[PDB]
Amino acid sequence: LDNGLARTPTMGWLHWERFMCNLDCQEEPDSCISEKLFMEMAELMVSEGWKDAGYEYLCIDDCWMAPQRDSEGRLQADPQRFPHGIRQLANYVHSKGLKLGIYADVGNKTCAGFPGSFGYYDIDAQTFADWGVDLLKFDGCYCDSLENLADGYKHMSLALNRTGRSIVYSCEWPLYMWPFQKPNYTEIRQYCNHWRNFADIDDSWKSIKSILDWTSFNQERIVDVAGPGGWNDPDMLVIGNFGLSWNQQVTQMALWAIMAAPLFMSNDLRHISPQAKALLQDKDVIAINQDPLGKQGYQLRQGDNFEVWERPLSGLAWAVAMINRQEIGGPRSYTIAVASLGKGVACNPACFITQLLPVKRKLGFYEWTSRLRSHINPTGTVLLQLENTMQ
């Protein structure tokens, strides 16, 4: 979408995976979907270093709404959980130097069953712009027709544009289309800043694997459409939660960087391990994800329970990720000729290789005829940066 936004993948925090649709503020006041939750995360996003690392958008997902629209046909924030209203929340978030994201649905209802925006696109766009909203995530539930789905996503894009306010537009259009027909990514890119392709992530290695496998399976269709202003969205980072081992967490961070993915954390920033925090704030890995060239990476090789992915970067550099998919035994060595990397130009005549995950280490100079050898933990990933040089 040519709105001048998302020139690099959008970074922020989104409540959905970790907090879901918890409406139980009586029994669980600190975890329920309410203004206090977002106020606290906004505070922590600044004080704990997330904003300085690039995480800018504090985003509200489903279940923020009152059961019904007001008498003027507007969406309302729930009066018990958001008593001060979204406008005051937006102002609070902006006073911290952050941006506010919000959620709506293209159909009759949101996925959790709250009011949908079908027949209200202009009213809702204008309501969000009035409030000071900076990003909309637009879900695809309760839409009976693929025509209405496509038309709704296009209409809201235009409606947001007409407000005059710059609003990142995050779509789930291809995801709700894929079962029934092939998405047209040239069309989607014109209307959306980023788009969900695949099923909801959860806090599991199985889920990370299936997203990587579906991305690599469909990479011919989706890799080349991504670029400044329009990104593939493989869903939230679940690092810092409960279901991923340390190696599995390194794998998600590494591959979301290779894939030029929006980086939306969904975790409890009040309760995050030093390790997960250091991984998520890793300046070098974030720089890869945010590389200004904006060319999405891809799977190069697959075999022997190993995967090799690579991404072209600016300044003639490349990122290489090698995943160990064997879920038994110990570290396994993988050896690859550097001449097979970066379409033969990454280390021609030479290159400097620096390892970034799971630890930072300079590996030295590699000639075009050299072989690269790494040990990789089961379900772990080694991420390298190849810096091309004529020495």
Place this chain on the structure above:
Amino acid sequence: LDNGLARTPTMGWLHWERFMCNLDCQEEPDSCISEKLFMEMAELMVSEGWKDAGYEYLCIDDCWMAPQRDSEGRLQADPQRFPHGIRQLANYVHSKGLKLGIYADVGNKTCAGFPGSFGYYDIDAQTFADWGVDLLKFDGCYCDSLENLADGYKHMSLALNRTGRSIVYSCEWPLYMWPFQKPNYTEIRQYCNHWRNFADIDDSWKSIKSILDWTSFNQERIVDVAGPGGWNDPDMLVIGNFGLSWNQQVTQMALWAIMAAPLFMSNDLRHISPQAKALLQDKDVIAINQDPLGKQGYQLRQGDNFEVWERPLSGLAWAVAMINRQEIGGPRSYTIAVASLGKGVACNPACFITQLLPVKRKLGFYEWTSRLRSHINPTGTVLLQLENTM
């Protein structure tokens, strides 16, 4: 098996899951299956507290053998990887106050392709006794028929007995005959100290889940047959490796205790985190696993992506494990009427409840009508001990 061994579930270390069949001693000398590896693990079992926690048996799995039997028809340790032989290894292990476990296969070959014991059961049994072996794991690969399989497992049990040496006999009899015929656990129990029922564990939450789900599904068949001298083997503990989150590690430790499982670690004791170590050496949880009454636990309840399991202990105590099987969201509130626990006698008229995992914490006295509210992390478990009080 009535040999006076495994009166509580056997505890130790087994190389297979973490080290497997690595023969590349040229390029990976510290990780290949060699006498060096087992000598190093032995040293660490003593120095780092493993022996004191109860982990006693240092066990060799597949791929220790030479490609061929010797001229006398005996198995031989690989000459390049075990140049000092198994007898010297057994002596070294015994000098550390530990016991030695070894591996063989009922069929013509081991699963990895080395010499099998079919037609050599008495030779091998005697060879192992002569070496001073204290435990045999006996695998089921390359066995043509169910007749041979059954007869093989029985033959080796008797052969071990005839040596006069006390040897723990660890079988895979039910695992390998399940596909074709329902195992007779009464028969299996008479011949074996423990038995593998299900597929090989690996370093994944998926595999932990599958083992628990298959156990609970089959718990009517297998729970009551367990007891002092004969245990169900859900396979190795994989805590301290690569594929399990912290909560998933706690779940395995808690549930292996509930299930009266043999506790065979398969990890690198040279490279293990402090958390994984503290969990594996947790005296209170190990005491549950090793409860002298030796009654295996079972799934009590399933619903709302929660599972409740319990185990009866000695002295009118119970252990209770509540698992959160929802793999999305945050810690989830679970409330249970304590009157549902221990067949209604656990907290009649009252009980003192102590949480053991993921942290140790006295929770206080509960009356029969009370409700316990826990918070359980996704894929995590809360483990409680209930002490009945008047």
